[PDB]
Symmetry: C2
Subunit: 353 residues, 2 copies
């Protein structure tokens, strides 16, 4: 039942990255157990939060009697502000005494140390300091955050997840766990390495919509269709640019060359023109199966019924509602079928550890 089967995990804070990491841990077979006060004002109801599926809720106001729990656990996922966790009985030091095999993970937007460390903030904020946000969106309108996928999960949840499974492989040889500091601002900055590479090389400019991946290239952006929908183009490689020009019913000689940056504004118009003369459906048909790198922008509802995502069963309907199947996928020790979120809190003495 999952490659991470047998791993005892203790989830504390209940928001964004914290719980999302917990989820994956459970999805991969780990025995995850949330610890939170009963008067929880969580939204939605835990029993309806896909971020808690496969987990077990346990009332336990922090009464330091939990140090007794950690000692039996492998991982402790701290999700509170820095310090608060050690302000109470629990903490990297205390836990160390009760269990030196413990993996003290900590997901934060600012990290443990630093001036901003005490400051409160969210995904949009952490992205403001890294410079990633300032490289998003159209030139005129202010920067618009990609929901909270970049910092909270892409560079938050995944970061602490990486750190945990790594701190596991470590102690699984050093026989001793340690503290893992997962800072969102850190993760995002690493997710942006390619940009830094560019920045040093001189491939970046000052204004937005100038780079290759920020809309500055007509062959890598979105075009509205006749029926008010959208198509996503990413014809980067010259070979794929060919396909794009082909299915679009355009002769290479008609449209400027990829190299003719100066004529991009014109290429955009030619692309916008053609793309808006048909419906997403028709277009999807045309570029279908070709290496043109042209796909239809699907909505949540639309995606869950997508042929590909269905075949590979990425978005499945597990007892209840539509959701995302565990990932990545393992060949010999795959993830068992998805269990539902905790229908009701489990006692505490009915643990297992």
């Amino acid at each position: 039942g999952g490659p991470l089967a047998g791993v005892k995990v203790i989830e504390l804070g209940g928001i964004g990255p914290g719980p999302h990491a917990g989820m994956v841990l459970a999805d991969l077979g780990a025995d995850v157990v949330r610890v939170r006060r009963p008067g929880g004002l969580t939204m939605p109801s835990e029993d309806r939060d896909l971020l808690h599926r496969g987990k077990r809720i346990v009332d336990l106001d922090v009464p330091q009697a939990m140090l007794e729990l950690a000692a039996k656990a492998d991982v402790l996922l701290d999700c509170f502000r820095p310090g608060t966790c050690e302000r109470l009985g629990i903490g990297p030091d205390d836990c160390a005494s009760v269990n030196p095999r413990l993996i003290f993970a900590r997901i934060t937007g600012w990290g443990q140390d630093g001036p901003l460390a005490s400051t409160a903030g969210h995904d949009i904020n952490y992205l403001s300091q890294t410079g990633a946000l300032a490289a998003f969106g159209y030139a005129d309108r202010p920067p618009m955050p990609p929901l909270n996928l970049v910092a909270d999960f892409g560079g938050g949840s995944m970061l602490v997840l990486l750190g945990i499974v790594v701190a596991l492989y470590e102690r699984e040889r050093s026989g001793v766990g340690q503290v893992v500091d997962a800072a969102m601002v850190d993760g995002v900055s690493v997710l942006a390495q390619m940009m830094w590479t560019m920045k040093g090389i001189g491939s970046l400019r000052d204004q937005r919509e100038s780079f290759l991946l920020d809309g500055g290239a007509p062959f890598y952006r979105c075009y509205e269709t006749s029926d008010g929908k959208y198509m996503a183009v990413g014809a980067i490689e010259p070979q794929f640019f060919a396909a794009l020009l082909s299915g679009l019913g355009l002769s290479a000689a008609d449209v400027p060359t990829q190299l003719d940056v100066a004529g991009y504004p014109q290429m955009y118009d030619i692309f916008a023109e053609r793309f808006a003369s048909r419906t997403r459906d028709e277009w999807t048909r045309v570029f279908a199966g070709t290496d043109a790198c042209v796909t239809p922008v699907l909505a949540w509802s639309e995606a869950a019924n997508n042929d590909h995502l269905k075949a590979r069963s990425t978005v499945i309907t597990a007892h209840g509602v539509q959701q995302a199947a565990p990932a990545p996928r393992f060949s010999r020790t795959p993830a068992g079928p998805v269990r539902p979120p905790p229908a009701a809190a489990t006692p505490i003495d009915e643990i297992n550890w």
Copy 2:
């Protein structure tokens, strides 16, 4: 020297997710070795690509004499289209024979199985199928991709990274490795779980700029300042919304209530008004240190010199140019200082395995 010290890794494909994962592996102590044909047309020169720092390049056209290499290695990071890897000598099967301890990781946008599997595509494309892209940007203009941070790295590089370190912990007990299928469309969908949760709960609407994290809430977006800069606001919690309203010099009674969604359009104007009457600098001073969740949107250049990111040394200047320090951070087995990208390809018989 890193928690992943001693891990033999073989990097094949050389684009986006593949090499970015390889980097982190090296950053964490792993012995990563890239294998690619000599006539490589890579951009930029490998010796100037931060995604290759701490790694070793090795000329080796695929001449199946590499199966002999895998057998000594722990991980094989396949980054080619599905099939191509097994179309040559190498492949999950063949490698299994020479080394059953091998971890055959595979990062793909569409994954191994599925109709689209053979189709070519990029970050913007993979995001179009999951439905995450259709939830990005302003309502009028088409969706604009957050560079390639979401799919390529946030749900690509990190996914295969997770899969690997997990497959390591697995075999590090089952004494047998396996195949890891990291599909970007898969990772992104898991990065979007929160959304799916919302989708089933009924918190999502059909149009954009309607949810809490997509700009539909004036207290969670960006505002242009007097000096044409931008400030990122994320005052979600009522307590923080207070601070926002305070430093902004507004009386609770002046601006509509968070609950008065119908008056959001108005709240937006009041926020845009005040925010645009001062410079990012001044504003940064005002909301500085307060839990208002109001920060300045910094550009790449500006971020590298940011006080916080400097203290925690997130963006450091390693021998040469500016880049992102390793992550996450470990307390007993931290990451050694960052080495530079391969100055020159290393032979092949000078390996170590």
